[PDB]
Amino acid sequence: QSYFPHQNPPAQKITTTIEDYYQHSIQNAYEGIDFFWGKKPKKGDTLEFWYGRPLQIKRVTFRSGNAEHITDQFYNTVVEVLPAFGDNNFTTILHFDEFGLADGDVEEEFSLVKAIRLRVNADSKYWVILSEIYIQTPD
Fold this sequence. Notes:
Layout: E1 13-16, H1 26-30, E2 36-38, E3 46-56, E4 59-64, E5 77-83, E6 91-95, E7 101-105, E8 112-120, E9 128-136
Antiparallel strand pairs: 1-3, 2-9, 3-8, 4-7, 4-9, 5-6, 5-8
């Protein structure tokens, strides 16, 4: 599969500073339609999911690359959350690892969020794919 859809919590806003490729938007990937395909990430790029009410989350999964494009990962990129109750600063919860996967259980302290984002810490020589985005709730 080039893509693993999921029903994710409805987002109020989804922003990215990464130019996408035709029919491969970040909204498409979040909404279960098809994989995200972005041009080369740059230092400082973000991809953000904003929620209109506090959102309880249990696990986050961002799968970068896919079988046909194994290079097209998020490198040197963090997953951060903006807690619902706290100031306007995101906190890092995960990194894209040696498999290009950012996946883990969210600690309880960071689990009630206003936003989830990816933030890129270095330029990449490759395009980027998200083939799985799963914001798992306790429901």
